[PDB]
Amino acid sequence: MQDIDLIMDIPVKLTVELGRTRMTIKELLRLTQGSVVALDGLAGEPLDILINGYLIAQGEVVVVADKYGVRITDIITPSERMRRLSR
Amino acid sequence: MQDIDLIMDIPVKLTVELGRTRMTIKELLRLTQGSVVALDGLAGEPLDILINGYLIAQGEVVVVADKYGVRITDIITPSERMRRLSR
Amino acid sequence: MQDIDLIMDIPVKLTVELGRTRMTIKELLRLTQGSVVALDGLAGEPLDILINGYLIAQGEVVVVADKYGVRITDIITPSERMRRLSR
Amino acid sequence: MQDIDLIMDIPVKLTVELGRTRMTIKELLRLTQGSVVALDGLAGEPLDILINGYLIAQGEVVVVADKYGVRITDIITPSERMRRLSR
Amino acid sequence: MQDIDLIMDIPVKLTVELGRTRMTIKELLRLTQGSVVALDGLAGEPLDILINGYLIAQGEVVVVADKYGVRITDIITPSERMRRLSR
Amino acid sequence: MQDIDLIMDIPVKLTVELGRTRMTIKELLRLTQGSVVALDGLAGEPLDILINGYLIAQGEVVVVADKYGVRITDIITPSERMRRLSR
Amino acid sequence: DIRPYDPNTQRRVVRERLQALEIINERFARQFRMGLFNLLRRSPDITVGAIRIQPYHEFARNLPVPTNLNLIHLKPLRGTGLVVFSPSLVFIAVDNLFGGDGRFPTKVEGREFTHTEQRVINRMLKLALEGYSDAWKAINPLEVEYVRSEMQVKFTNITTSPNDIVVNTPFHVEIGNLTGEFNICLPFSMIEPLRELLVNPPLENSRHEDQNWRDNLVRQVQHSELELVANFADIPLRLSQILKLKPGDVLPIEKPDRIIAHVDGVPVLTSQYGTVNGQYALRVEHLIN
Amino acid sequence: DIRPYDPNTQRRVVRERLQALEIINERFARQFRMGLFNLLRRSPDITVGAIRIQPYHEFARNLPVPTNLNLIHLKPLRGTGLVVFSPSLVFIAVDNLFGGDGRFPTKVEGREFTHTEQRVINRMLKLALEGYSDAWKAINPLEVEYVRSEMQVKFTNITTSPNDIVVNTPFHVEIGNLTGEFNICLPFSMIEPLRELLVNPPLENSRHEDQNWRDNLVRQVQHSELELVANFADIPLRLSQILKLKPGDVLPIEKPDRIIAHVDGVPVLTSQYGTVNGQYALRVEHLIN
């Protein structure tokens, strides 16, 4: 509608997250330069795409001539979103 | 539509601006504690309302029992928006 | 230094923000002429002062003979800035 | 008309802009002699042509026997002008 | 026409000149603070109005509530323009 | 020096400008005989003094027995000149 | 609930009880009673008035004109304190020091204090300063240094704004029919860092025990848990594009030289992505400091 | 709103309250009261008149003829200040210094001051100068140096134009039925650089704190953002050509040896265009200074 066009003039910010993990503060203090930290996500899984910190879609990492890119694959339809938030 | 409902779940940020002004850096350095700085806007003029830094409407300042509030009065329809951006 | 003097000749823009709030787009559509919108900030709190959209200090609202003014009170030293950005 | 002829006797000034970019003042201070600064525009894009600071047309860069020249290609018709100003 | 409307969106600059005179550089060096310099124009004569340094009309000086104003009186039709340029 | 004396023999032209303003061509066409046009400058402000179209000093308007005169007051030192050209 | 905003209006800030400040005031009252009895050769009666929290202008408007105002600094805290002596108390002290019996009631003058009266005020001020310093020492080390004496709010601006919150503790001195009063005013910002110390009642010193308590608290908190999130990169886009996200859509992003690790939106370090043990890894480079 | 212009007319400039100037005037009044009591052996009463802002000619027309005018310089500020002594005050001082009781009313003379009266005026002037210097020292270091004494506006032109704005602070001196008056006049341009210091009320010294405040303000502003625009070249043309801009139209331009970088119309440096990383680049050469 016309208000969709009005908010179209408003820029927004997109965020791509590689993964997430949980650990104690003591473990973080144990970490030093060159330390290795694992993530919950596996290899080849689509990465989360966030708009102002809200996940809306998923994509795959590509490189464009010198720049990283995300190839959108799937959405976060309410059933899947509720399932992943329940975790 | 359904995508309007989808983006409804996405929170946004609103910004209220009292006014704007222009000055040199030397004048800013001259400013000290307790200094007085004027603004382009006059008294009683509606204040700008910004969504993620984009002006969408104007309102008037009110106080709600202990908290400031903005009473929306007018919009920033494209003619007025272009006129005020041309300034 | 001399480069401080050089950039002094360069004018900058100052922005004063009354407050901020978050709401859904559906709530904004529900809003009409004369609607009342609340803000996160309370009454009497110092207002944010922004230079090109970056907060650098806080002040209090005064009126100069017919014109609004801001009476600077405090700064946004890195500890407080990080604390308020974490919110 | 006759007033078009009258203003024809009045000379005007034309400005050609290679490109535009945005950066912080701190980054500018970091810049030294021989520093490299990028621009938003890409390679081969038509350059903006400005009359007294107002964009009216676009052209392509050519060299005339020892002197640079602009080969006009397109106009800034209101739809495109509004689209590029919205950016 | 439509191009008149297009150039209407282009702002222009207007210049009002009180008068003109000719003197040697030695006389200018003789001039000090508070010195008196005469002009060719007489008292009550219409002042020249220039657009980007080109004379197009003449007017009379008025004051608007605190601001000087020019009350347009006559034009610079080609016969008069040639006559005054021949001087 | 001796070349200052040589150029002293060369006469120059001085220009006094009452004020300046900006308007559209359509507004100028709307103007008729007896129309009132405002200027950016206020009442009592020193007028610009131009040598061959270059501002070098400011003065105040006086009348000498039947002839207008300019009473020089201040200069256009580079800081003020840059500040007023930035406008 | 909805009210119109007035820039010339301000609200209050609940209650800020300072039991330690009251204890310091009582100790200073005892010391000053002893000092005044020593000085004037007569036994005074000092009553500690209720501690008052009010804007600076409200305190200023209640001060009789002229009044003796003394500027003091409570080192190492930053600010300027004020000691207020009413003209009646100064007149009583002058009368007592010069053999006056106090039978004659004091006459309103509204005149600047004489240099002899200035010396009387200084004699009172030194003892008051010693007493207050000793009283404050019981809870926290402080040094009081007098700056200058003024007779009007014109010579004030101890505070940046007239509406700034200040703490005023009145004291009433009685050596007979006399009921003289002196006040101590301190800006709230000066005592703001020591708010925790002044609010809760003091306990026994046990400085080593308190240090051990803090060490144990630090040790226990070290085993707490959080969530570490690393943002790969960010993209500026528009909502219309978001409405058109489909499989296979490629969005260009800027290549991040370093990966910044954030904890609840708080950056903690910058690293680089890697592949170790079949999972993504971050090679820590520098901590955010 | 529309009015006809008259070159012999001028307007006013709002209000320019100087609280610091009033405080300096009060301190100078105290010092001068002490000095006059020391000199004339009688207690004077000095009242500070309201500070006045008016054109120079308006101040000149109110001065009785003849009057004692003294030229002073407030170093390091550039200009010439004036100290105005009314003939009545000089006559009162002469009468007091020579045993006159003041019973006889003063007679209008309109005559030049005698050299003895000149020495009386100099004796007053030295004390006034010391007092005013001491008063100004409290807020900013200044030195006052007397230049010469004149008895008419003929010998003036402290100001370039008669309509220049000056600041006049009257003072009323009373040592009985006498109500003598002296004035201090200063051009506005002399105190223009110190306008910020004089307008807002002074605070505590805290010079190190103020320097730290300025340093923090500088540091925070250093992270601000702007827009950098480089103009390739400029062309002089006409509007008729602009109406005929079409695809393929070639317009000759002068080859720029250097590319000037402007920020909101403010040149900052000159550079040369280049092609680096597939995008246009500017090799910075010299900064605009």
Author numbering:
A (entry chain t), B (entry chain p), C (entry chain o), D (entry chain n), E (entry chain C2), F (entry chain C1): 51 to 137
G (entry chain s), H (entry chain m): 34 to 322
The authors write:
Initial two-dimensional (2D) classification analyses of manually picked particles revealed that like the MS ring, the C ring adopts a 34-fold symmetric architecture. Local refinement of the C ring with C34 symmetry generated a clear density map for the C ring in the CCW state (CCW-C ring) at an overall resolution of 5.9 Å. The reconstitution revealed that the structure of the C ring consists of four subrings: the inner, upper, middle and bottom subrings. The C ring in the CCW state has a height of ~160 Å with the minimum inner diameters of ~332 Å at the inner subring, and consists of 34 protomers. Each protomer is assembled by FliG, FliM and FliN with a stoichiometry of 1:1:3. FliG in the CCW-C ring consists of the domains FliGN, FliGM, FliGCN and FliGCC and adopts a twisted “V”-shaped architecture, which is distinct from the extended apo structure of FliG from A. aeolicus. In the C ring, the upper subring is composed of FliGCC, while the middle subring is assembled by FliGCN, FliGM and FliMM. The bottom subring is formed by FliMN, FliMC and FliN. The protomer of the C ring has a “Y”-shaped architecture, and obliquely binds to the neighboring two protomers in a “S”-like manner, which generates extensive inter-protomer interactions within the C ring. The head-to-tail packing of the αtorque helices in the upper subring generates a periodic distribution of positive-to-negative charges along the CCW direction on the upper surface of the C ring.
